[PDB]
DNA sequence: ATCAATATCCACCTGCAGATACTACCAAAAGTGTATTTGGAAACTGCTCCATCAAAAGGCATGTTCAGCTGGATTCCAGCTGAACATGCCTTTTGATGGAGCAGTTTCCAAATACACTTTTGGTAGTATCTGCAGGTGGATATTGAT
DNA sequence: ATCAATATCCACCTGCAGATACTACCAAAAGTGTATTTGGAAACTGCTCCATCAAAAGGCATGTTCAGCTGGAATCCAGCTGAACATGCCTTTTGATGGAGCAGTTTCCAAATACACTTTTGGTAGTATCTGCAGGTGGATATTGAT
């Protein structure tokens, strides 16, 4: 079946994320709203990561590219180097 | 005793102002703001270029580091034009002597 | 007769000073000749962009002299300058006129 | 009558379950699929370290969970127990992620 | 028969007035005493450049104005027009000032 | 030989009308009675944190005078960058 | 030869901290005391987290510290949480926390 | 092949000193490495700006100290300063 | 209150992925010793500007009265979202397998640094003189609110 | 709609704070030129680890039904909060003085960089032994929700 990739982020998975966020009851429009927010996040982070990849003249996005990108966005991440 | 020289970008800001708005002046407080702006953006770009060079085990900050720093720092159109203005200035510079 | 590196680059902003500030700032062991030129151009371009929009705000307000208020108006009304300077406070700049619709009478 | 839990009972059960664990909550491959698609728009024919993709999913999930917490507070602030787009938007606005 | 503007009319007039101007809204000398009192509790026998005090007041007023903006959105979110302490607290929690 | 009067309770110098005006610039139309004390508390925390950092810069430079730059540096590291007062 | 770490009474590597400072372009010069002081501060902070994470491991009836234990240690500590407030710990999860108004009855 | 430095063996040393019979997984060790690197960068960076602000070309223990006070919350800062002063004192005498 | 249906917990057990203890190898890194350089603490002091002074006055804070209309409590009900169940679809596993490309090594030159000397310039500094616009007035237009 | 009270507008003007102008001066800055050193680009290539492949296995996502209960709409009303007024205080403004301390200049040595050499160590690679605990089982019992 034809399927967009952001729709691969399923309603039950978004539900579980909300649960860990302490959310008890979820409105129907939340799932599309979340996918849009998710997409902007990844776009911002990956854009910066790829920019580090290009500068290093590589074709492979490394974990360090991602970690450096996240630090720029004020989303510092422990556990993957750096 | 002469009070030491306090450097600013004022005369350069002023030149660009006249290029852009020939009949417009600028107050000292507003010039103060512009000076803070240029210094701030300088440090941001220079800082990003520094990390960049360190991540890649390079000891030299070149125009290429500056360019990637500008792309990381500036949003959309501002980046596009900054990169273009930057590239143009370097090509012109190297084409002399 | 000597040429400034700025004139050689076709720039108003000082290439020499920017080069010195780069070396003096402990950013790297070495600084290429192209680096201060590129950086001075970017700084000059951004200065031009802000002064252009501020000059318009001054004109819009029947003034010929740019003051901090005009700089703030130009920045917060431009989406990209606002993003670049989202964590910046312009002294004596005030805020944009903005009243939430629900607060209006009817 | 066959057994049936009241609405909200199982939801609370799920909260306790997932706040106890640390495992990722988005399926790996669909996420991997999404990452490559977005990256393709910035630069073509990229490859990814496996750790790079995992670093992204950890960062992305931790972000959404944190956003959902703030969203929950906004819903409760308006005397609701149901989160709405209204709540996400307010949280992101105040966070400075927009407007 | 003595003229009265309705509740809220003058408030809106004041919003338009102060959003139009840039002058500081806290009195100068009282703010300076507050700064000196606070600094004194941290370190005795300090002196202040006049521009140092003004820099602090510019920062404090820009901080409070911005906070009152977010506070206003929190009140409107609760279908209120009146800002309350819990609006300020919500805004500061989401900002990460108390979280 | 003589010292100035004791400094106390100056937070009340942040008057109710001064807080109202700030709320107005922030677009606020209606204000609950308890806002004024909440705001004073919030302001004092903000001021304390910035001044503490500024004075730390001052002491490090072995000065007795807090400069505009001390404040600017303090604001920068608290993520409240300020244009118009220095470097 | 006695290493500077031993000479300083530290487990953390003073020689490495010094080299990292020099090559980091933080300044033109580095006083001999700076890497000692910094190595000590880093060792102390490391000890503080490992203590608390160790306790958290005990509380969960484990002998081996895993990421979850580090997360519990940091978020349950007012100062460590503030220090690492803009940091996410991979595979750390969150603290058990349910808003009162969501509880039944 | 080239070598990759980490703080792993020093983290492990400090662990056995505070919890002699406690282990640590490799993932958890990765987090600790990220932590030490992060705090190093923050303190070094702050000390750098301090030296620059004061027209200094040398980062000394004094800059590291002011940087620690600026970056760490109250009690963590107090103990860190104490640990730092102790180590420089013993290093001076040893 | 009873009572049935699930969820949840504790004790115990076992396979194994991941931690460990070991020996050997080695490039880099840290320590040592010597020569050289130099940052910045001292000392001295010129001089900015900070703290404090007085004195006059009006902009603005304080406190009160009054009641408009907002927030909060209450009720009510349509319908939205949770729970449960039945499918079946595709994520997951893992194992092998090309081979892309990261990364290590060698070569070498365009460009960087160091340095000595010459020139240009931007920053006070001291006076001297325009000029944009703040703030005052006065009168015409607009807004708000009662009727 | 009419009208009246008041805010709002805008032209007009004048005093002056602050912007502009000029000369003089010069220390630092910037540029030139020559010699010397080297970072990193280029080319080749070995080995890591990434992409893809098959191929079940089944766990988990999707679609449907039903109804509990939440969100939102409507209604009411006590009393909070805004608007206006009278009173007069303390912030603002203006100007001056002493001197605290910031800052500019010079001397000087303790400490840092710079090499050369020696010794130590942490990362490594196989290689083999060990173990904390995930995950499974059974059975106790706690919780939930029907009466
Ligand atoms: Mn006190
Ligand atoms: Mn010297
Ligand atoms: Mn009434
Ligand atoms: Mn209402
Ligand atoms: Mn190849
Ligand atoms: Mn000149
Ligand atoms: Mn006017
Ligand atoms: Mn080389
Ligand atoms: Mn019904
Ligand atoms: Mn309800
Ligand atoms: Mn009074
Ligand atoms: Mn003195
Ligand atoms: Mn060893
Ligand atoms: Mn188990």
Numbering used by the authors:
A (entry chain B): 21 to 102
B (entry chain D): 29 to 125
C (entry chain C): 13 to 118
D (entry chain A), E (entry chain E): 37 to 135
F (entry chain F): 16 to 102
G (entry chain G): 14 to 118
H (entry chain H): 31 to 124
What does the paper say about this structure?
The nucleosome core particle (NCP) is formed by wrapping the histone octamer, comprising two copies of the four core histones H2A, H2B, H3 and H4, with the superhelices of a 145–147 bp DNA duplex. In contrast, the N-terminal tails of the core histones, which are rich in positively-charged lysine and arginine residues, protrude through the DNA superhelices. Furthermore, the N-terminal tail of H4 is crucial for the compact folding into chromatin fibers.
We analyzed the biochemical characteristics of the reconstituted H4-acetylated NCPs, and solved the crystal structure of the H4-K5/K8/K12/K16-tetra-acetylated NCP at 2.4 Å resolution, for comparison with the unmodified NCP. The crystal structures of the H4-tetra-acetylated and unmodified NCPs were refined at 2.4 Å  and 2.2 Å resolutions, respectively, by molecular replacement as described in the Materials and Methods. The main chains from V21 to I26 and the side chains from R23 to I26 are visible in one of the H4 molecules (molecule B) of the H4-tetra-acetylated NCP. As for the other H4 molecule (molecule F), residues S1–A15 and S1–K16 are disordered and residues K16ac–I26 and R17–I26 are visible in the H4-tetra-acetylated and unmodified NCPs, respectively. The electron density corresponding to the acetyl group of K16 was weak in molecule F of the H4-tetra-acetylated NCP. In particular, the position of R23 in molecule F and its hydrogen bonds to E56 of H2A and E110 of H2B, in the acidic patch of the neighboring NCP, are conserved between the H4-tetra-acetylated and unmodified NCPs. The H4 tetra-acetylation significantly increases the B-factors of the outward DNAs in 7–8 SHLs, particularly around SHLs –1.5 and +5.5. Thus, it is unambiguously concluded that intra- and inter-nucleosomal interactions exist between the DNA and residues 1–16 or 1–20 of the H4 tail, which are disordered in the crystal structures, and that the tetra-acetylation of the tail impairs these interactions.
